[PDB]
Design a protein around this ligand. Structure first.
Ligand SMILES: Nc1ncnc2c1ncn2[C@@H]1O[C@H](COP(=O)(O)OP(=O)(O)OP(=O)(O)O)[C@@H](O)[C@H]1O
Ligand SMILES: Nc1ncnc2c1ncn2[C@@H]1O[C@H](COP(=O)(O)OP(=O)(O)OP(=O)(O)O)[C@@H](O)[C@H]1O
Ligand SMILES: [Mg+2]
Ligand SMILES: [Mg+2]
Lengths: 106, 439, 483
DNA sequence: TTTGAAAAGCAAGCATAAAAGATCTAAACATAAAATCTGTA
């Protein structure tokens, strides 16, 4: 079942019953009738929606909110930092790398 | 759970979570609830929508950014909780407590206990929602502060008729991830995409734009049509400057406010039903952002010489500035052999001594038996240098309690290259010729 | 007026400021302080009292546990030395300092209190003159200067602030003649706690013993014999003196005698036990209680090996009695409302839980993500030997261990959970699921140390526990030791 | 017009000075309750 799968995933990652309870509570609370509650506990799709929301503001999820210019500046800063011995960079070096990539693309 | 879920666009999951967690019954309400999202993600807006759609809930609103430190926050909690309980139940005689007596977290526990024990005549148990909107925006924040607030409910009485419930809003993920083993229920507010940003901008701004005074004076100088004009302007602003702003509601609102009257002034009788002709009529509004707002000659040449002293190595100076006739046999410097690979003006400036700066200042300053046309370092030069340090255009290794006369103290320029470029253009000095041959 | 800040919770005592030197006009104006109704000692207990509505069932081991509580068979030479010094200095009306040092629980405070009790009995027989006993514990003081407030309040009955109390005590010990005085015996317990930076309190207390009119006995109980040499100056070390009394930790025979003295009337004795409830009466079944001499001997030998601390030996015996009483009450189902023996098994189980380590069995019961973190951390310590590893290197090495053992059954079932939480709608994540959770869990457990850094990648992490017990916990796991 | 060669420049290595800041304490600035002085009634 989906419930045992989510319990198993919590057992191997968090091993915490309050963590599971914090997901189970809005599954019960957002149900409007008994049939919706039984469908929600059989499918556990709200647990997937909850898990997606809990990861939405991390480094992976913040990257997908960036515009193309923001992504270009971040990529340029990252490759300057990778070329640096100590990983340090500033605005000038990142802008120089950025204009080198824009004229190399254009 | 008997509560109303308001319709908030693009925040339906967050509103359903707020309906799951925030209720008038203290038994099925968490003691702590966290809303986490970055700036402009509609956290405050949907909490406002939820509490206005449920007016029976008792919410107290606090702004930690207006309180700066922990002690004013404790005093604000005591003051606002006591005032809210006073206006909620006016038929309950209460002994007033001074919020300035709260100087410790323990004093807040004691004061809240004393405030809550004069309300046991109430029939039902009641949540009092204390909302700390912007907890991590507190200026004197440290890591130990939030632990006191999340353990505060364990020290209050358990059988009290009034039960405080904390709702926090946080901005940054790393601050929230410091406290993950506490297992506090959290609702995340991911950043909007560009279509949601455009829809929010239209539905929040087209009403104010279509009853603006400039448009209403322009239509008599030259409602759904005005709505389409304002909406097309908002969509053009988004497509022009979304790369510049990102998914920022505030920055796009500022750009709309800056560019709307200049767009209205280009509207003619020919331009209203032709959005393309109106767009080419106001092309310069959508090409650049336009979000922006007397030094002495000795001070200017001292700044130029300090920039040179910061960004040129002193071993080569004799190969640039030396121009005197050698009575004595002597070999000048050969000059640098290889160019630099990286432009040194991209890096932080290097430190120099006073006499090197005076040497380069004497070498670059503008101009017979009893003349000696070179300018020597008199008191006006040193006064200009002292003022230049006062304005932080030049800086030292030490920032406070500065021994100016110490030989250990070294000096650096503190201006960027564009500032020294405009300064050198004000006195017709060719500073770009000094860096052209070195990289 | 408008204040710049407020102090709204100021609680100030009713303590006067004028010292004792201005209490009378001259030295000759001072009366005989012994014939004064406030000098030398001339209400909260009932609030913790209630009425009992039941009948507590005291089982047969409850008397053993009660007699094993902390509330002089092995201290004869120490008792005789302290008592002889104090008797000689009291009866001849002189001032002296006695120094006592030792490890915790070796009977220092008990021996000094017994000496003071015997001296009070001798002063009640008119063999030595009367004296006042004052007990100042430096760990029971809020501020170290409050000892000045305490001692003077014990002498005069007044309540002064600490500086005025210090001047009052100085004037009293130096100027008041011996015919108008009483002898004072002061026990300075936890003497290291009254040591401050300026050491004025230590100098004053040991310098008042050098005054001719003082009639003051200072018994200073310390924890180390070299406290004046390590922490004090030469002036206070000269005043304390060369004679110092060391309280050695007890040997196992004296611990054996201490435990037998607490159980002289209970051991090998008969009780009337009521089988309906469990309540036992010391002289319905006649049950003999017994605690083994081998059990007491092995507990005493263990304790004398560790510290020679009588508190530990009494606590080990009480824990063994508690374990046996728990098993007895479980097997009879008695509640709280022919031979009962506390055996060497209970003594060994009491001695083992204090010597058992939970760190290894804590680490073997963690989730797979926390164990994977610890395993990757140990792998990085094996690779470069730095003993501090950056968290980004741990992230990269966890990712490497996942993609290298990808054909493993457990790993190829765990990868979707680790990087997507078993969901197709969740993007591949840069950290594993529960990365922050297991990091903070290992930090709160004290297994891990983390530097205070804001960049998450270059932040270093260190093992706080020993490396080999972490390796033992890692080799306990089935999956990690196979890859 | 050549010469060549001694001065100038490059560069790896390494001891060492110094920048930055973490941590802390003294001192100026500030408030306050109980006790004690002080000029009258
Ligand atoms: N879902 C929405 N529907 C309509 N308008 C919205 C929505 N979300 C945000 N807005 C508009 O954007 C404004 C900014 O949002 P809001 O103040 O709630 O952001 P926030 O996440 O609380 O920001 P901050 O952390 O800076 O305080 C709101 O005042 C509102 O006008
Ligand atoms: N000789 C003894 N005979 C009987 N009981 C003893 C004896 N010595 C110690 N004890 C028991 O051990 C307890 C601890 O003794 P005491 O308080 O004198 O120790 P201490 O040396 O002052 O320790 P600490 O430095 O921890 O204060 C006593 O209260 C008593 O119950
Ligand atoms: Mg807000
Ligand atoms: Mg003691």
């Amino acid at each position: 079942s989906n419930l045992n799968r989510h319990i198993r995933m919590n057992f191997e990652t968090f091993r915490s019953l309050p963590t599971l309870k914090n997901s189970i509570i809005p599954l019960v609370a957002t149900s409007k009738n008994f049939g919706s509650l039984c469908t929600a506990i059989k499918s556990c799709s709200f647990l997937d929606i909850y898990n997606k929301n809990q990861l939405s503001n991390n480094l992976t999820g913040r990257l997908q909110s960036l515009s193309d210019l923001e992504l270009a500046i971040l990529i340029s800063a990252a490759r300057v930092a990778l070329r640096a011995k100590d990983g340090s960079f500033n605005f000038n070096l990142a802008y120089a790398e950025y204009e080198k990539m824009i004229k190399a693309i254009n | 759970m008997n509560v109303t879920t308001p319709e908030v666009a693009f925040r339906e999951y967050q509103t359903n979570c707020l309906a799951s967690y925030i209720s008038a019954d203290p038994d099925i309400t968490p003691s702590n609830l966290i809303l986490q999202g970055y700036s402009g993600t509609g956290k405050t807006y949907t909490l406002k929508k939820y509490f206005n759609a449920n007016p029976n809930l008792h919410a107290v609103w606090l702004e930690p950014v207006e309180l700066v430190s922990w002690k004013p926050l404790l005093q604000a909690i005591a003051r606002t909780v006591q005032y809210k309980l006073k206006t909620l139940y006016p038929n309950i005689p209460t002994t007033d407590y001074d919020p300035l007596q709260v100087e410790e977290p323990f004093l807040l526990v004691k004061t809240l206990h004393n405030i809550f024990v004069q309300y046991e005549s109430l029939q039902e148990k009641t949540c009092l929602f204390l909302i700390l909107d912007g907890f991590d925006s507190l200026q004197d924040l440290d890591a130990a502060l939030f632990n006191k607030y999340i353990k505060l409910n364990e020290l209050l009485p358990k059988d009290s008729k009034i039960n405080i419930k904390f709702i926090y809003t946080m901005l940054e993920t790393s601050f929230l991830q410091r406290y993950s083993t506490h297992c506090i229920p959290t609702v995340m507010f991911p950043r909007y995409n560009v279509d949601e940003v455009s829809t929010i901008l239209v539905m929040s701004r087209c009403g104010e734009l279509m009853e603006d005074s400039c448009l209403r004076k322009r239509i008599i100088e030259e409602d759904d049509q005005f709505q389409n004009v304002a909406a097309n302007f908002i969509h053009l602003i988004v497509q022009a400057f979304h790369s510049y702003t990102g998914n920022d509601i505030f920055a796009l609102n500022d750009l709309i406010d800056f560019k709307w009257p200049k767009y209205v002034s280009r509207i003619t009788k020919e331009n209203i039903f032709e959005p393309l002709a109106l767009y080419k009529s106001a092309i310069k509004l959508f090409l650049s952002t336009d979000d922006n707002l007397d030094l002495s000659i000795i001070s200017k040449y001292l700044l130029i010489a300090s920039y040179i002293c910061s960004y040129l190595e002193p071993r080569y100076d004799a190969s640039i500035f030396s121009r005197k006739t050698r009575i004595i046999q002597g070999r000048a410097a050969y000059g640098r052999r290889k160019k630099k690979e990286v432009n040194p003006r991209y890096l932080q400036p290097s430190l120099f001594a006073i006499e090197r700066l005076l040497a380069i200042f004497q070498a670059i300053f503008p101009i017979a038996l009893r003349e000696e046309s070179l300018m020597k370092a008199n008191i006006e030069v040193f006064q200009n240098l002292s003022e230049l340090h006062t304005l932080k255009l030049i800086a030292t290794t030490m920032n406070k309690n500065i021994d100016y006369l110490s030989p250990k103290v070294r000096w650096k320029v503190n201006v960027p290259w564009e500032i020294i470029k405009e300064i050198s253009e004000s006195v017709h000095f060719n500073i770009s010729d000094y860096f052209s041959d070195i990289h | 007026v408008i204040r710049k800040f407020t102090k709204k919770n100021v609680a100030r005592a009713k303590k006067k400021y004028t010292p004792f030197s201005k209490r009378f006009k001259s030295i000759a104006a001072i009366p005989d302080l012994t014939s004064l109704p406030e000098f030398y000692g001339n209400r909260f207990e009932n609030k913790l009292k209630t009425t009992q509505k039941h009948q507590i069932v005291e089982t047969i081991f409850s008397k053993v546990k009660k007699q094993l509580n902390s509330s002089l068979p092995a201290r004869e030479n120490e008792f005789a030395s302290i008592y002889l010094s104090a008797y000689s200095a009291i009866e001849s009306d002189s001032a002296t300092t006695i120094y006592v040092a030792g490890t915790p629980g070796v009977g220092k405070t008990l021996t000094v209190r017994e000496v003071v009790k015997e001296l009070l009995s001798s002063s009640a027989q008119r063999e030595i003159p009367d004296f006042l006993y004052v007990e100042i514990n430096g760990l029971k003081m809020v501020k170290p200067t409050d000892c000045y407030e305490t001692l003077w309040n014990k002498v005069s009955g007044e309540r002064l602030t600490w500086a005025a109390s210090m001047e009052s005590l100085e004037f009293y010990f130096k100027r008041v003649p011996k015919n108008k005085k009483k002898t004072i015996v002061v026990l300075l317990d936890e003497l290291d706690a009254m040591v401050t930076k300026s050491q004025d309190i230590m100098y004053n207390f040991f310098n008042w013993t050098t005054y001719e009119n003082a009639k003051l006995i200072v018994i200073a109980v310390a924890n180390t014999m070299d406290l004046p040499e390590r922490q004090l100056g030469n002036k206070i070390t000269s005043r304390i003196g060369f004679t110092r009394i060391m309280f050695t930790g007890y040997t196992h025979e004296e611990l054996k005698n201490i435990i037998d003295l607490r159980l002289k009337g209970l051991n090998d004795s008969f009780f009337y036990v009521d089988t309906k409830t469990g309540n036992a009466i010391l002289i319905v079944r006649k049950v003999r209680l017994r605690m083994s001499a081998d059990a007491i001997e092995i507990a005493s030998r263990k304790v004398a090996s560790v510290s020679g601390d009588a508190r530990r030996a009494l606590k080990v015996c009480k824990r063994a009695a508690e374990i046996a009483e728990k098993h007895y009450m479980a097997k009879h189902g008695y509640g709280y409302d022919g031979v009962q023996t506390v055996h060497i098994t209970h003594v060994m189980k009491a001695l083992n839980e204090t010597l058992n380590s939970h760190v290894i069995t804590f680490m073997t019961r963690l989730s797979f993500t926390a164990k994977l973190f610890i395993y990757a951390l140990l792998n990085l310590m094996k690779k470069n030997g730095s003993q501090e590893q950056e968290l980004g290197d741990i992230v990269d090495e966890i990712k490497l261990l996942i993609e290298v053992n990808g054909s493993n059954k457990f790993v190829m079932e765990i990868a979707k959970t680790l990087f997507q939480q078993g969901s197709d709608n969740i993007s591949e994540q840069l950290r594993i699921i529960s990365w922050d959770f297991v990091l903070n869990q290992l930090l709160d457990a004290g297994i891990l140390f983390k530097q205070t850094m804001k960049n998450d990648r270059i932040c270093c992490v260190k093992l706080n526990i020993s490396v080999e017990e972490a390796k033992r916990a890692m080799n306990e796991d089935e999956t990690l030791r196979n890859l």
